[PDB]
Design a protein around this ligand. Structure first.
Ligand SMILES: Nc1ncnc2c1ncn2[C@@H]1O[C@H](COP(=O)(O)OP(=O)(O)O)[C@@H](O)[C@H]1O
Ligand code: ALF
Ligand SMILES: [Mg+2]
Length: 512
DNA sequence: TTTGGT
């Protein structure tokens, strides 16, 4: 049941008119966007609405890719003129600009004007036009009192989206939803959150937020944890991995390939987001960090089911697709593993580097599969003929020396679940000659119980812990505390009335 | 202290 106000903003997009809506955290913005994305596709075709957002996880909430990933601009720190020449040299991305009828963009507060103007320049010169965006309908979404775009230099403040040429050209009104939905039970809580949107903590709200520094109820509901910087996040994801039953599976990065520099080259190789050492467990929660295909993108969340190799997986897949299979078909690949590679790879320079990656030793023992992974056959009267359960296990044991890789179940935007075997991807910073300067093979997965407050923006975390220990940018404490649905579900550490203040540029916007 | 690429 969408609200009347939420429904009208959807209709309004039938105008073709650029619309920009807003309203404090958790008002239904990104939900109604989902249905407006349905009508904009029904107007220009599925393939011609660009559904993007500022951070790849926030993109998945509305079912789409990052603004950079759609645009083809990479990081887009380059010259306005430069990016355009890069986009036009990619058929996929060129004709993507040629053909789009809408650009939906959610969590706009983290878009920086400098980039919007670059995208405007690209949208025009490619679409051969001079309208606001080469005439693309803009749907803009968010709350500017939440996180601003990331200022690397904090003595060049990064010029929020509305400071741009392109915005003043194409946004000449703001709509504003006012009813709050996320916290909708805890009314005092909402008022407490609203006076945090501005920096108006009083003597009483502080005391009431400090009452929330108690411990979350301890049950099997694993709580989400939000911290300011990536260190405390990484630390709390391990503090949860250590608490999870089972051994860790260490995945060690493969690194090359230019001559001897080490003053920053490992400052370059810690600076990859691809840890030199990635630990996982069965039942862990991971998030993809590389755009890999249409529905498996940076910001997909998943839960590791067990670890397999290709061959042990090809068999496991067979059984999920025929869950009442005759047990004979298995023993043919169980006890005749020559004919398994027969049936498997009949289905169709960097290949050797990702070969030696995740290679168990020729003799290292092989922990058997979990009995969790056979619960799908566990819907019960007469004849249990899961000898098949033991059969798979024998197949798994043959992977001694083979390449064992985490089998993840991902739950997509539309809650469509999809299981993939996560091969390693590779990262590289390359020169003008593309030379092997600095390379790293690694799994494109991160643990996802904890999130930086930035990646936390967009999500609803019913049970959540918040540690405002290092909060630095304006809005950061608002975004974090505003994730929780109830005070019951919330725990807050290190409350500091003075590290909670609002950006002046934005109050100026909301009144000039 | 933070995001973003294939
Ligand atoms: N029409 C609605 N009625 C009831 N609850 C809603 C409605 N729309 C959204 N919600 C809930 O409120 C929360 C906020 O929705 P969302 O669109 O993410 O807010 P935000 O505006 O901050 O992006 C969501 O978790 C959603 O479950
Ligand atoms: F803008 Al939001 F949760 F998507 F506050
Ligand atoms: Mg939203």
């Amino acid at each position: 049941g969408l609200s009347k106000e939420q429904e009208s903003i959807i209709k309004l997009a039938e105008n073709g008119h650029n619309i920009f809506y807003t309203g404090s955290a958790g008002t239904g913005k990104s939900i109604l966007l989902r249905e407006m994305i349905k009508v904009l596709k029904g107007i220009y075709g599925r393939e011609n609405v660009a559904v993007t957002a500022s951070t790849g996880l926030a993109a998945c909430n509305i079912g789409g890719i990052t603004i950079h990933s759609f645009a083809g601009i990479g990081l887009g720190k380059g010259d306005a003129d430069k990016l355009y020449k890069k986009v036009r040299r990619s058929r996929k991305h060129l004709r993507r600009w040629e053909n789009i009828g809408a650009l939906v963009v959610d969590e706009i507060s983290m878009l920086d004007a400098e980039l919007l103007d670059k995208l405007d320049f690209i949208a025009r010169k490619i679409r051969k036009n001079h309208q606001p965006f080469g005439g693309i309908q803009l749907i803009f979404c968010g709350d500017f009192f939440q996180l601003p775009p990331v200022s690397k230099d904090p003595n060049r403040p990064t010029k929020f989206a509305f400071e741009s040429k392109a915005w003043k050209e194409g946004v000449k009104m703001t709509i504003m939803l006012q009813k709050v939905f996320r916290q909708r039970g805890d009314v005092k809580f909402i008022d407490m959150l609203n006076r945090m949107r501005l920096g108006n903590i009083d003597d009483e709200t502080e005391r009431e937020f400090k009452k929330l520094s108690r411990p979350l109820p301890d049950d099997e509901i694993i709580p989400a944890e939000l911290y300011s910087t990536r260190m405390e996040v990484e630390r709390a994801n391990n503090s949860r991995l250590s608490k999870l039953p089972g051994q860790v599976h260490i995945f060690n990065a493969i690194d090359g390939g230019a001559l001897e520099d080490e003053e920053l080259k490992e400052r370059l190789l810690q600076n990859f987001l691809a840890p030199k050492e990635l630990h996982l467990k069965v039942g862990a929660q991971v998030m993809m960090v590389k755009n890999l295909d249409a529905t498996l993108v940076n910001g997909s969340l998943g839960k590791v089911i067990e670890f397999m190799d290709p061959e042990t997986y090809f068999c496991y897949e067979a059984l999920t697709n025929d869950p009442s299979m005759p047990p004979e078909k298995l023993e043919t690949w169980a006890e005749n593993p020559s004919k398994l590679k027969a049936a498997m790879e009949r289905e169709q320079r960097k290949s050797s580097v990702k070969e030696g990656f995740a290679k168990s030793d020729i003799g290292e023992p092989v922990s058997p599969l979990d009995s969790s992974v056979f619960d799908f056959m566990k819907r019960v009267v007469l004849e249990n003929i899961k000898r098949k359960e033991q059969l798979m296990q024998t197949i798994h044991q043959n992977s001694a020396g083979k390449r064992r890789l985490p089998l993840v179940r991902f739950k997509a935007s539309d809650m469509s679940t999809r299981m993939v075997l996560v091969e390693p991807e590779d990262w590289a910073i390359e020169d003008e000659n593309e030379k092997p300067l600095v390379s790293r093979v690694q799994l494109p997965l991160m643990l996802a119980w904890s999130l930086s407050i930035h990646k936390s923006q967009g999500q609803t975390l019913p049970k959540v812990k918040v540690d405002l220990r290092r909060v630095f940018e304006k809005g950061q404490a608002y975004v974090a505390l505003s994730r929780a649905v109830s005070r019951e579900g919330l725990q807050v550490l290190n409350f500091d009335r003075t590290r909670i203040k609002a950006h002046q540029k934005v109050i100026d916007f909301y009144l000039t």
